[PDB]
Amino acid sequence: APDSVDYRKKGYVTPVKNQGQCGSCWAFSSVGALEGQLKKKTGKLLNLSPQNLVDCVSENDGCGGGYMTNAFQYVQKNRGIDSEDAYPYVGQEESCMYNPTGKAAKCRGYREIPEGNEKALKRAVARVGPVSVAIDASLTSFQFYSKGVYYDESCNSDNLNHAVLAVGYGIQKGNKHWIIKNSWGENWGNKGYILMARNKNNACGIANLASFPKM
């Protein structure tokens, strides 16, 4: 595995999205991971539909919450997920309106990385591509992150209240990090991104709930 990796440089990542006031981070996270695999498999990069997941993954709670694992399973069982263009994002609860004609990607299942194993997470990211992960993003410092490697001794790994996407990893002046793509718009963090402390005792619980879909 490379000392550092950044899948944005390998065309696996779409631009930052804005989930709005709907707690659908798990949908954007799942979609990001899926978009990466689709690119790896077909060579094409397309915006997948998070609203499709929000409205159709009954295993989850729509804007009220959910897990990326349930999303990947839905795509597999549903035999597909629509493109963002075929099922645009509104960030509001609506009955499922999935349409197979707009299908843009399928899923063969998913794998989970050993809970709290950042070493496993590193290897997974380097080999697979973008990986869905959960973190404690409740701290004010996270809300107003601007640059640098984010680290706060107050983060609680047991409080997984947000789902994001790890598109790579690296180091900055002795501080190892995870390159994280958020879904709170480009007006947050660094153009929507944030570098988070890596190998710092699983800061914010970044390795507690990480998984990726297979295609």
Ligand SMILES: *C(#N)C1=NN(C2=[C][C]=[C]C(C(F)(F)F)=[C]2)C(=O)N([C][C][C]N2[C][C][C][C][C]2)C1=O
């Ligand atoms: C998103 N958006 C979102 N997700 N959760 C959540 C619940 C259970 C499990 C997960 C995950 F990612 F699978 F592990 C995620 C959640 O509780 N909320 C409420 C978030 C409140 N925010 C906390 C950080 C500060 C901003 C507000 C979600 O919105």
